[PDB]
Amino acid sequence: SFHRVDQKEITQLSHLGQGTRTNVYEGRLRVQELRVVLKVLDPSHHDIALAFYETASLMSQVSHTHLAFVHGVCVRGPENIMVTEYVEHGPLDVWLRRERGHVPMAWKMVVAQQLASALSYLENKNLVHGNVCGRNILLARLGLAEGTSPFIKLSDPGVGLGALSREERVERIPWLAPECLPLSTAMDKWGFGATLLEICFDGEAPLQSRSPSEKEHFYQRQHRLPEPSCPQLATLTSQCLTYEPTQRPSFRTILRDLTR
Amino acid sequence: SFHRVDQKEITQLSHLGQGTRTNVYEGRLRELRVVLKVLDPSHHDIALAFYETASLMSQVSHTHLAFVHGVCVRGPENIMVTEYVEHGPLDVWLRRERGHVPMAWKMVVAQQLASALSYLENKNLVHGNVCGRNILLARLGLAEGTSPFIKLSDPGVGLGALSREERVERIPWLAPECLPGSTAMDKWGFGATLLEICFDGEAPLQSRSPSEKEHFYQRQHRLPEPSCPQLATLTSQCLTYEPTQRPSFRTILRDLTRL
Ligand SMILES: CNC(=O)c1nnc(NC(=O)C2CC2)cc1Nc1cccc(-c2ncn(C)n2)c1OC
Ligand SMILES: CNC(=O)c1nnc(NC(=O)C2CC2)cc1Nc1cccc(-c2ncn(C)n2)c1OC
Ligand SMILES: [Cl-]
């Protein structure tokens, strides 16, 4: 399970954004104060909150260099608050869009290897992340500067996919595995593939802009996502972004292929 | 001395604040992100003090010194083009994070400020405007294991061109020997900034009137003791009215890595 955090120990600071049924804030935790990130769940039903706890538990009961730490959950009136690791530079997508055209291929390859690494760890433990996207990739060390390499940390997947509505699942296209449109570790290989494209297209994922019906139509008509600009990831993404879950490579394979 | 920048190459954006005879803006250099220090309509002596400042920064290179791209000199306009530092002035941040800034964080800033100032010392160059405002935070060092990373800004219009009223406004950072009409002056600035850091962006006398401030220096009064006794000796050594009695930055840098 997960560690319990009293309301007294946490301080809510500036708003960083909104997740699926959550509001992300900067914050402090008394342990010596630590800079935390608070994911404040919306007033919710028992099934939604349980999906939130299950997510805390996944992140609490694991340990990897490229996985964000979960301090615990605080249960305050209608709100539940996940207390998570504060990462220096925040979401990757935001940064890649800000640094558009000035992000070198080697930088992107390091991020890929690191993301495949953390996802291979969850694979060997037979655990599903269920929300691999650029936003959920946080930059602990920036790596864009002469003589620097990036250091990423994969965020909690938020409210478990199982509790999400169809409308909510559609919003996750192109990262959402098409079999999840109507929970296997096979789903994270599609997420990894779609994120690999988002990284290549400097934080601009294909279909992001398109309408929910346009997005739903793409999956219904079994259409395939664009090819990455860099031909190094071209084979890997095509292998990952297959509609047949069994046809997706293992992260053990992906991790090997990335070293070449 | 200084690189010249054409007016066509620069785009002015959001006003960030005002300096001594300047207005600070966000800007674009043809398309890189910079900070434009737009000098007020000025006399030739004021503009020359501005160029001298550009030259100081232009002809130097240090990890904890802000970069100066050059000066745009067109007709009545004088614009210094400089490095944009992500989180901006330290004083603003320290006041925002008041009570939640740990001592170790402040020591790191101090060591970094003493290092950039030791570099100018070994080159026998005067900054002349060491204050909280002129320390810019490139990295906040908020995450565990992460440390802050500061960059010292240009000192603005050289102190030599400032009026008495303008010099009085720089109390307590201004060296008292600079009030009427040396690298020793930056040791006082460093000392007064070390107090401002300790008092979480609240420097002593900042609230007091110009006459109250002038009176403090005239009557040879000494600035308060820092809350943290680690910097207590260092600040007392730095904030002496005898310029020759101030430690070298070589000494300060040693003392910082021992207390
Ligand atoms: C587990 N740790 C984190 O989640 C986390 N950790 N650190 C930062 N640091 C920072 O931002 C540093 C720059 C100030 C941001 C983080 N999250 C984050 C921030 C903003 C929006 C979202 C969000 N969640 C869902 N959506 C759609 N968007 C979000 O979740 C990933
Ligand atoms: C060389 N580079 C700089 O000086 C500089 N670089 N980056 C920022 N970034 C930002 O602000 C990011 C946070 C939004 C601020 C900077 N200057 C600055 C901003 C506002 C006021 C003054 C100012 N100067 C004199 N006074 C009284 N106040 C000022 O000069 C130091
Ligand atoms: Cl970094």
Swiss-Prot record, chain A:
Domain Protein kinase residues, every copy: 10-260
Phosphotyrosine: residues carrying this PTM: 25
Post-translational modification summary for this protein: Phosphorylated.
Tissue: Observed in all cell lines analyzed. Expressed in a variety of lymphoid and non-lymphoid cell lines.
Source species, domain of life: Eukaryota
UniProt subunit comment: Interacts (via FERM domain) with JAKMIP1. Interacts with PIK3R1; this interaction is important for cell migration. Interacts with MPL/TPOR.
Role: Tyrosine kinase of the non-receptor type involved in numerous cytokines and interferons signaling, which regulates cell growth, development, cell migration, innate and adaptive immunity. Plays both structural and catalytic roles in numerous interleukins and interferons (IFN-alpha/beta) signaling. Associates with heterodimeric cytokine receptor complexes and activates STAT family members including STAT1, STAT3, STAT4 or STAT6.
Disorder named in the UniProt entry: Immunodeficiency 35: A primary immunodeficiency characterized by recurrent skin abscesses, pneumonia, and highly elevated serum IgE.
Recorded family membership: Belongs to the protein kinase superfamily. Tyr protein kinase family. JAK subfamily.
Protein name according to UniProt: Non-receptor tyrosine-protein kinase TYK2
Organism the protein comes from: Homo sapiens (Human)
Source species taxonomy: Eukaryota, Metazoa, Chordata, Craniata, Vertebrata
Shown residues in whole-protein numbering: 580 to 868 of 1187
